Design a protein around this ligand. Structure first.
Ligand SMILES: [Zn+2]
Ligand SMILES: [Zn+2]
Ligand SMILES: [Zn+2]
Ligand SMILES: [Zn+2]
Lengths: 463, 463
RNA sequence: AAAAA
RNA sequence: AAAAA
C-alpha cells in the first residue's frame, strides 16, 4: 500500500528579521535620491537628495525659502510623507557623499526625524554648509562623522558600516547595514577605480568578505548600467587633461579650466599641472573656494604655496584684471561655470561683465560633461556660443564618468552575492538596463530582482 | 575742373609656376583616396585607396579578379579616367601609409603610370603584398622606400619630403612636395600624439620651419574635424586596455582581445600586457600574422619569445583546441574579427566552428570602434549577438581615434600657415566641419579655402 | 573609418 | 548626471 519517496533535511532558523526596502525618491527619476531601510521596527534613511532640474523649470524659486511641501509637489525633493505609513521609527540618516542629489534635501526634511545625520568628514562639512544656507526650516540634527572602514552601532540589532569606494567626489562610501539576519548594502554613486588620483582603491577584499558573510539585499545605482564595459579610471581624465594643458605648441596662449568645484581629484590634478606649466594656479568662484578650501583644511589635498583663491566678486574681478595686465600666459584660472550657470565666473567672463577679455585662440577647457537635461543644455549652449563668438577654442568633455558601467555592476554582483538586488538612482529605463544585466547573472525579476517605484516598500522576511 | 590721380603699376618683374590640385577620390566619401598634385606639367599622385563598403554591398565579389573599370563604376576605387584631361604627366605615386583606403587601389591603377611608387618601408612591404594578391593586372611599377625625415628628388623642379607623424598604423608621414614657388603639403590620415607608444612624436619643429619657408597649399583630412578638442593619445588606449585586462577580480576567466591587425602599437601593448598577466600571447588570423610578422621582421616591434602566431586555419584551430584543454586562464588570444568580418577568427568562434567554446563570463574585448557604415554595423551586431547568446561579456571601444580632432587641425594651420587649404578624405559633411574651423583661423571659402569634389581640378597661380 | 581569408 | 551665488 505505501512506499517511501523522499527524505528532505530541514534547515534551522535561529534569527528572523523583517527587512523593508522603501523607495522614497530617485527611483522614477534622476535626482532627489532617498531610500529607507527598515530592520523590524527601526529605520535607517540613506540619502536625501535634490533634483535640480525640477527647480530650473520654474524661474522665480529660490529653494532656500520654500517649504518642504511645495518642493515635494514640484518634486524637486523626495516625498517622504509616505514614511508616516512605514511601520518603524527612524534612528539615523546616512548620506553616502556630498553631491546635492544625496544631501540637497537635508535642510528640508532631516529636521523632522529624531535621528543623527551620519556621513564621512568631507560630506558632513558640506551638509553643514548646506544647512547654514537654509533659513526657512531650523535644522541641525546631530551630525556625526564616520570614516570609511569604521562601524557605528545604532541599535543593538543594527550597525552601520562605511566601505571605501570611488566616485567623482572624495569620501564616498558604500553603506552596509548589519542585521541579525545579514547585511543590506547600499551602493549608490560609486565607481571602481584601481588607479584613483585621490583616496584609496575600493575595498574589494571587504566586498568579498561581506559576500561570504551574507548580503540580504543590494541597492545600487543603475545610472550607467547600460554603458558597456567598465568605467575608465580617473587617471584617464588626469592624463587627457595633462595632454590638453601641456601637449601643445601654443603654450603662451590664454587658457582657462572649468570643472565641478566638488571634484577635488580633478582640481588637484589641474593645480599640479599648473605648477608644471610654469603658471600660477588661480581658483575663482565662491563654490571653488568653499569646496577646495574645505578639502584642504581637512587634509584631503595639498596646495602649492603660490596658489591663489578668490570667492568674492571684487577679488575675483581684481584677480582677473591682474591676470589681464600681467599676461594670461602666466596664470591658470580654474573657475566655476562649466554648466553655464548664471552668476558663475566663466559666465560672467562670457558676458563681458569682467575685466578679463577672451581673445581669438584662448583655450577654454571644460573638464566636465554637459548634464543631459534641456535646461542645462541651454545654459551651456548659450555660454559656449558667447565664448566662441569672442574667438575662444573649446576643449570639451575632458572628463570620465563617476559611475559604474555594466561590467563593474557585474563584478559587484559577483563579489557581494546578494540574495536580492534592487536598482535605484535612475529612471525605469536605466533600471531596465540593470535588470537585463542582473538576469545574465542569475537573478529573476520579482523573485530576487526587484523593480521599485517611488513610494513602494519591498518586504523581505529573512529566516 | 574736377581731378584725381592714380599710380600705374610697372609691367616689369622685380619662371612661373602653376599648381593644380586634382581631387580624384575620397573627397565625396570615406575611402578610395586619391589626389593628384600638378606642378605645371609634372604630376605627383598621392594615394590610391579602395572603398570597402562599396565592395560589401555586392555579394560574392572577388576584387582581385575585377578590372579597373568595373570597380570604378562600383566606386570602390578612384575614377582616375579624369586624368586623361589633366595636362601633365605623372612622375611619382606616393602613399602616406598602408591602410587600404590609401593603397587598396594600387594594383588596379598604378600600372598605367610610368612612375615609381614611393612610401615608407612598412608601407612598401604592405604594397608589395597588395600587388602579390592581384590576379587581373600585372603590376609592375618600381617600388621605392623613403623614410620619414628624408627627401627624394623627382624632377629638376620637384622634390618629395616625408615628415614623421602619428596615426593608427606605423610609418605614416606627411608629404611635402617642393616646387620653385614653395611647398604643397599633404596631411591625410594624421594624428598629433606627444606620447605615442610606438614610433616618434610628430616633427613639430619641421612643420614650423615649413610654415616659415612657405606652404602654398595644405591638403588635409577632415575626418574628425567635427570632434571638439584634441585627439586623445594612443597612451590613453594603452591605459584603458591595461585596466580592462589587469584591473579585475575575475582574472582566471576566459579573455579574448580583438583589434586591427595593422594597429601594431595596440597589438604591441596587448602582448606586453599578456606577459604581465602571466598568460601566453597567441595571435590568431592570417592578417594578424602578416601585419605583425612584417612589423617584427623590419624591427618595428620586439616580441616575447613565448609568443605564438598562427595565420593558417589548421594551426589556428589546433591552437584553440590547445587553449581549451589547457585552460583559457593561461592564454591571451589576440585575433581578427573585430568588425565581425566573416571568416575571421572571432566570427568562426562565435559561430561554433572552432574547438574554442565561449562560456558564461568569458570576456571579449574589442580594442576598436565599430566602423559607422550599415554593412559593418550588421556584421558586428550579428557577431556580438552570437557571443552574448553564449554568455560572453562584451568590452567595446577600448580604443582612441587615429585621426586629428578640430584643435589639432587648428594648431596644424597655425604651424604650416598655408596660403590655401583643401580638406580631403571625407564626406562633404566632414569638410563642412573643417571649413568652420579654417574660417575661424582666417581663411575664406572660395578664396583661400576650397571645397573640392571628386573630378575637379583647382588652379593656383602665382600673383 | 577600417577589412577579412 | 551635476549646479551656481
Ligand atoms: Zn554622485
Ligand atoms: Zn547621485
Ligand atoms: Zn589611415
Ligand atoms: Zn585613411
Amino acid at each position: 500500500h505505501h512506499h517511501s519517496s523522499g527524505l528532505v533535511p530541514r534547515g534551522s532558523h535561529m534569527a528572523s528579521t523583517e527587512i523593508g526596502i522603501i523607495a522614497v525618491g530617485g527611483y522614477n527619476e534622476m535626482g532627489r535620491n532617498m531610500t529607507a531601510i527598515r530592520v523590524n521596527e527601526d529605520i535607517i534613511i540613506i540619502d536625501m537628495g535634490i533634483r535640480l532640474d525640477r527647480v530650473q523649470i520654474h524661474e522665480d524659486v529660490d529653494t532656500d525659502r520654500m517649504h518642504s511641501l511645495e518642493l515635494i509637489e514640484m518634486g524637486a525633493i523626495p516625498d517622504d510623507t509616505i514614511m508616516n505609513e512605514v511601520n518603524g521609527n527612524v534612528r539615523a540618516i546616512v548620506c553616502t557623499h556630498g553631491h546635492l542629489d544625496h544631501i540637497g534635501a537635508i535642510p528640508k526634511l532631516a529636521h523632522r526625524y529624531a535621528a543623527p545625520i551620519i556621513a564621512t568628514p568631507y560630506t558632513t562639512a558640506l551638509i553643514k554648509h548646506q544647512i547654514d544656507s537654509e533659513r526657512k526650516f531650523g535644522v541641525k540634527n546631530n551630525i556625526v562623522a564616520l570614516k570609511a572602514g569604521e562601524t557605528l552601532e545604532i541599535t543593538k540589532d543594527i550597525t552601520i558600516e562605511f566601505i571605501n569606494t570611488q566616485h567623482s567626489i572624495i569620501d564616498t562610501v558604500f553603506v552596509a547595514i548589519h542585521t541579525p539576519s545579514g547585511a543590506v548594502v547600499y551602493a549608490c554613486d560609486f565607481k571602481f577605480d584601481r588607479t584613483p588620483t585621490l583616496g584609496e582603491v575600493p575595498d574589494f577584499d571587504r566586498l568579498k568578505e561581506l559576500g561570504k558573510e551574507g548580503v540580504i539585499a543590494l541597492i545600487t545605482e543603475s545610472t550607467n548600467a547600460g554603458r558597456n564595459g567598465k568605467t575608465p579610471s580617473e587617471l584617464i581624465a588626469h592624463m587627457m587633461l595633462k595632454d590638453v594643458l601641456l601637449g601643445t605648441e601654443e603654450s603662451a596662449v590664454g587658457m582657462i579650466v572649468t570643472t565641478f568645484a566638488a571634484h577635488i581629484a580633478r582640481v588637484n590634478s589641474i593645480v599640479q599641472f599648473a605648477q608644471e606649466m610654469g603658471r600660477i594656479p588661480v581658483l575663482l568662484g565662491r563654490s571653488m573656494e568653499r569646496y577646495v578650501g574645505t578639502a584642504y583644511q581637512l587634509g584631503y589635498i595639498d596646495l602649492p604655496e603660490n596658489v591663489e583663491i578668490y570667492g568674492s566678486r571684487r577679488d575675483i574681478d581684481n584677480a582677473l584684471k591682474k591676470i589681464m595686465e600681467a599676461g594670461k600666459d602666466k596664470y591658470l584660472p580654474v573657475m566655476t561655470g562649466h554648466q553655464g550657470e548664471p552668476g558663475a565666473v566663466l559666465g560672467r567672463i562670457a558676458n563681458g561683465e569682467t575685466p578679463f577679455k577672451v581673445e581669438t585662440g584662448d583655450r577654454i577647457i571644460f573638464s566636465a560633461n554637459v548634464i543631459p537635461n534641456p535646461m542645462t543644455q541651454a545654459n551651456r549652449y548659450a555660454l559656449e556660443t558667447k565664448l566662441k563668438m569672442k574667438g575662444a577654442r573649446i576643449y570639451d568633455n575632458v572628463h570620465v564618468s563617476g559611475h559604474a558601467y555594466r561590467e563593474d555592476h557585474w563584478e559587484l554582483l559577483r563579489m557581494l552575492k546578494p540574495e536580492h538586488v534592487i536598482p535605484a538612482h535612475g529612471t525605469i529605463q536605466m533600471h531596465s538596463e540593470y535588470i537585463q544585466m542582473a538576469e545574465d547573472a542569475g537573478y529573476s525579476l520579482g523573485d530576487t530582482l526587484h523593480l521599485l517605484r517611488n513610494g513602494e516598500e519591498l518586504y523581505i522576511e529573512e529566516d
